[PDB]
């Protein structure tokens, strides 16, 4: 109450150094601060949301300003395929002359960095062609951040402070979010695409000072209100259109052509505008379901209570779930995290097969970086979802109110779920490892023809059902005469089949025996991570080894050496253990993607088709072969522009190894060492005048585990990012 942790007296009373270490660690756990109420918690959450919005806006504004000030956007827009984008300049007192001469790239007059984020293509596609536009956008985003901060301060005040009954209004919030947040935004984006982006694509310029005198369509708003909507899809862009010029253009603003633009190898802008229009209409229609002050709509409580099957196969059904979800915020956080992780994984899987930005398909490093980034983010979010689900079970579950509903039945039979997950994981791991070892031994002995190679017939059949003629089946869309083919031929397949039957793009790449084993390994990783997280979540309240686990809390070191020894017994340890498996699975996925795409780009696909069926091929033809250019960043003779990446490479390794120190060695040794060091400091002359204020002690158990995990993750991410970027940028192919 008087020391640094003003929100916790118990942490402020002890004289050791851990008072500092834990003070940073528990600053955002509002439910642990003493003298806390529901109102204060909700208001603090609201203020934190406002601060986060302000930070995001400031970050985007800073990126835009730096790109405008130190970039080459005006030089890049003219020749997108022969200019390297620039992110920001480099000022460094430690740079030598060779580094200054070697880091000068592009049209810059000094050292610069090449931007692999991919914002140049995104801003070019939407209709930005000058630095003044970037400056105006940065100013607007700065204003938005200031407005967000002002709103947060205003809503932290007593007069404008909301009440708890306002925060628990689910129906009104759902209606407003479904109608205005999702629908109106899509409508505005469609308006922007029709008004600004499309005319910019056709060589015209429409800005704030002349957007009221220019008609997006020569017909006007007449066809829309009268009914002949097809008039808006009359003259599409020709196949000889050149982006940003008035050669071979058209007048249509909403089409359903499908496929890719030939020159830019990206989706048509009219298709995007049409999609946004349809999505906005659907969201606006669907945002009227729930009841409000107007006396019509649905009640979520009655909807949940009415769903109970006769015969009692589901217990009491969904009775009491509304209160359980509404009262607890960890349930909401878990649901939101699961949805966001699924959405992020979908975005990562979609943005590489159906690109939407001009000239981004021919920039390979940007594609790889974006895919890896989004997949890692999705993995972390998916882990957090289960973590908060376990927290909810620990804290906010009431057994009496949830009697014999779906949650009670879920808690009833955890053993069967855990056993079946373990069986699946064991099966997959055993057989994948066995097949890989057999193939490796067969290659080692010199008889490759004895390999066990199994074709992925199901995926090939699914691909052939979409209109791919590389296998032989004629099913659904592949057959010339069929209900689906005849129904859809008039509108979208003429472009879709052409796009899917090209070998240059990444749309439905051909697969063989090499993808079967990798897919099964991915499934094994998913199953094992799910098993770990599910066991941690279900066994949170208690088990046979400790039937009163809920009394201690979510995180606690152990329960002592008794009963045979109980280490890593809490659910926090289960999340801790599942983090490693999440990292390994994401690493496998990224390795597969990067190797397949790098072989596709390099011009030879037989290398992956042949060497991916055994692990020695993975070790020799992927890492050792591709690291040659990366490890030669600096040598005794000289250095080049890759040098920094090489440094980062080594840097990552070091951090990884450091994690091991916190992950094997434990506390007692270091405590005795600290005691000896304290004696040594006290006894020496000329240094005993200086004395500490907080007694030095060794780190705790959970703190050391967290530190080791952080080091492991940082090393992993930095090492892989350095290797991927260096390998993909050394060849640019």
């Amino acid at each position: 109450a008087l020391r640094f942790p003003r929100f916790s007296q118990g942490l402020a009373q002890d004289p050791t150094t851990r008072r500092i270490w834990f003070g940073i660690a528990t600053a955002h756990d509002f439910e642990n601060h003493d003298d806390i109420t529901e109102e204060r918690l909700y208001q603090n959450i609201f203020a934190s949301h406002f601060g986060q919005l302000a930070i995001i806006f400031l970050w985007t504004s800073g990126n835009l300003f730096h790109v405008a000030w130190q970039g080459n956007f005006e030089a890049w827009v003219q020749d997108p395929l022969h200019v390297r984008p620039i992110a920001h300049a480099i000022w460094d007192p430690h740079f030598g002359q060779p580094a200054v001469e070697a880091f000068t790239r592009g049209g810059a007059l000094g050292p610069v960095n090449i931007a692999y984020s991919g914002v140049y293509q995104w801003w070019y596609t939407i209709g930005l062609r000058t630095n003044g536009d970037l400056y105006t956008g940065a100013l607007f985003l700065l204003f938005l951040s200031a407005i967000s901060l002002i709103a947060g301060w205003l809503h932290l005040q007593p007069k404008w402070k909301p009440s708890v009954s306002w925060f628990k209004n689910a129906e009104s919030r759902l209606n407003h979010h479904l109608s205005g947040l999702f629908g109106v935004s899509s409508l505005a984006w469609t308006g922007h695409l029709v008004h600004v982006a499309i005319p910019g694509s056709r060589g015209e310029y429409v800005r704030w000072n002349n957007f009221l005198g220019v008609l997006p369509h020569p017909q006007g708003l007449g066809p829309l209100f009268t009914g002949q909507w097809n008039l808006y899809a009359q003259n599409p862009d020709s196949s000889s259109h050149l982006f940003g010029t008035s050669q071979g253009t058209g007048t249509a603003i909403l089409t359903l052509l499908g496929g890719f633009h030939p020159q830019t190898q990206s989706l048509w802008l009219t298709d995007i505008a049409h999609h946004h229009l349809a999505i906005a209409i659907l969201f606006l229609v669907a945002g009227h379901m729930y009841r409000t002050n107007f006396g019509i709509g649905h009640s979520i409580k009655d909807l949940l209570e009415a769903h109970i099957p006769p015969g009692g196969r589901l217990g009491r059904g969904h009775r009491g779930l509304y209160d359980t979800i509404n009262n607890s915020i960890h349930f909401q956080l878990g649901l939101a995290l699961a949805s966001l992780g699924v959405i992020t994984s979908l975005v990562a899987q979609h943005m590489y097969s159906l690109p939407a930005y001009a000239f981004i398909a021919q920039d390979f490093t940007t594609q790889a970086a974006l895919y890896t980034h989004h997949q890692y983010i999705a993995g972390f979010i998916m882990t957090g979802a289960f973590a908060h689900g376990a927290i909810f079970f620990i804290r906010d579950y009431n057994p009496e109110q949830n009697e014999d509903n779906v949650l009670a039945r879920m808690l009833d039979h955890k053993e069967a779920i855990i056993s079946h997950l373990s069986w699946a994981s064991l099966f997959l791991g055993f057989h994948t490892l066995g097949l890989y070892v057999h193939n490796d031994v067969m290659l080692a002995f010199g008889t490759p023809e004895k390999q066990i190679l199994i074709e992925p017939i199901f995926a090939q059949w699914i691909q052939s059902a979409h209109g791919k003629t590389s296998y032989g089946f004629d099913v659904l869309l592949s057959s010339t005469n069929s209900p689906a083919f005849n129904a859809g031929r008039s509108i979208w397949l003429p472009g879709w089949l052409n796009a899917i039957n090209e070998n240059s793009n990444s749309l439905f790449l051909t697969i063989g025996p090499g993808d079967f084993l990798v897919h099964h390994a991915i499934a094994l990783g998913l199953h094992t991570t799910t098993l770990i997280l599910v066991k941690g979540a279900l066994d949170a309240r208690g088990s046979k080894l400790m039937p009163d686990k809920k009394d201690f809390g979510y995180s606690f070191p152990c329960d002592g050496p008794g009963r045979g020894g109980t280490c890593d017994i809490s659910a926090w340890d289960a999340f801790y253990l599942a983090v490693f498996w999440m990292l390994n699975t994401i690493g496998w996925v990224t390795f597969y993607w990067h190797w397949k795409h790098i072989t596709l780009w390099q011009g030879n696909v037989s290398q992956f088709n042949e060497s991916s069926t055994y692990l020695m091929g993975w070790l020799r033809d992927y890492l050792w072969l591709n690291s040659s250019q990366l490890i030669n960043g600096y040598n005794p003779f000289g250095m080049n522009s890759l040098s920094v990446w090489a440094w980062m490479f080594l840097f990552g390794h070091l951090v990884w190894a450091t994690g091991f120190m916190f992950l094997i060695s434990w506390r007692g040794y270091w405590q005795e060492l600290i005691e000896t060091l304290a004696w040594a400091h006290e006894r020496t002359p000329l240094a005993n005048l200086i004395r500490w204020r907080d007694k030095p002690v060794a780190l705790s158990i959970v703190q050391a585990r967290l530190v080791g995990l952080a080091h492991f993750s940082v090393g992993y991410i930095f090492t892989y990012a350095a290797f991927l970027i260096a390998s993909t940028s050394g060849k640019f192919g």
């Binding site: 008087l2 020391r3 640094f4 500092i20 300049a89 000022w91 204020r693």
Partner: peptide, 30 residues
């Protein structure tokens, strides 16, 4: 111009020292 030569030393060195001193003084205060 020459803004980086004035701004990089400020953010790199002076501001971290000021922040560290302020945080140490606030933490050690009773």
């Amino acid at each position: 111009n020459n803004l980086p030569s004035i701004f990089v030393p400020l953010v790199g060195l002076v501001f971290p020292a000021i922040a560290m001193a302020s945080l140490f003084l606030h933490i050690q205060k009773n």
